[model samples]
Target: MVKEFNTQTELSVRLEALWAVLSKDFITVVPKVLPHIVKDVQLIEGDGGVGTILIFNFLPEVSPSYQREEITEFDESSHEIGLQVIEGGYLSQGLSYYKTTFKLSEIEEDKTLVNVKISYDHDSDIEEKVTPTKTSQSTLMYLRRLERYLSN
Candidate 1:
C-alpha cells in the first residue's frame, strides 16, 4: 500500500528567517525546539548536506519510537528539502518505503506557507503497525514549533 499526505500551515515569520533556521540550524536545534515530540536528533553522517544521515528519537509515547533517515534532496533555490527513511520507524514495523519533503513559500513580507509532503509504502498484511495519523500530527507540530522558535 502507498499513502501520501500533505500539510500546509501559514507562519508569522519572514520566509528568509524561516529558511535560515531550516537550512542551517534546524537539525542541531530540533530537540530543543520541539522537546515535546522529539527526544533527540543525532547526526550520523555528512555535514548537514545532501546524504546527511540522522537518527530521530521520539518521545516514549510516540509511535515508531525512532527513525533513521537520510537527506535525499536539498535545494535552496526552490526552498525544498527531502528525507528518505532508510531504517527503523515505519520500516521496522512493516513499511517498505517512506519519504518526506518540506517546502517553504513566501506569502508576504512576514508570512510564509509551510508545506510538508509525506509518502510511504507498506504491505496490507502489516497495515495496523503503521500510524499515519500520528506521523502527520508530528510533522504539523514540528512546523508550529519552528514558527514559535523563530517568533522569539
Candidate 2:
C-alpha cells in the first residue's frame, strides 16, 4: 500500500530563513519541532549530500526507537530536500519505507509557504491504515512549532 500526504504552512520567516530552519540548522530546530518524538539527528556516514545517513532517535520508551534515513535529494536552488527511510522506528507500523520532502516558496516579505510531502509504502494487510487518535501529533503540528519558532 502506498500513502501520500502533502501539507502547507505559512512561516513568519522569509524563504532563506525558512530554508536555514529546515536545512543547515535542523539540529537546532529539532528540540522545538518534535522534542518529544525526535531526540536528535545523528550523522553516521557521508557528507552533507546524497548517500548521507541520518539516525533519528526518539525518547527512550518507544519501541524500534530510532529511524535511519538517507539523503535522497538536496537542491538548494529549488529550496528542497528529500530523505528516504533506511532503517529503524516505523517498521512495526508495517511500513516498507517512507520518503519525505520539503520545499519552500516565498509568499511575501518575512513570509513563506512551507510545502511538505510524505510518501510511504506499507504492508497489504496493515491494520488501521491511518491513525484515528485525535490527540496524536502530526505533520501540521510540527510545522506549527517551526512557525512559532520563526515568529520569534
| lDDT per model vs. reference | 0.83, 0.74
Candidate 1 residue-wise lDDT, 1-152, digit = tens: 66787878899999988887776677767888888767988888998889999999999998778989898989999999888899887787777888888899999999999888888877767756666666777777877888898888
Q: Judged by TM-score, which candidate is best?
A: 1
List the pairs of residues colliding in candidate 2: none
Give candidate 1 misplaced runs (Cα > 4 Å): 1-3, 59-63, 127-134
Candidate 2 local lDDT, 33-74, one digit each (tens): 788778788778986587888888888876678888888988
Which candidate has the top score in lDDT? 1
TM-score, model 2 to reference: 0.84
Candidate 1, position 57, lDDT: 94
Q: What count of clashes does model 2 give? A: 0
Query: Ten-residue segment with the worst summed lDDT in candidate 2?
Result: 128-137
Candidate 2, after superposition: displacement of residue 23 in Å? 1.9
Error in Å for residue 59 of model 2: 0.7
| Each prediction's number of clashing residue pairs | 0, 0
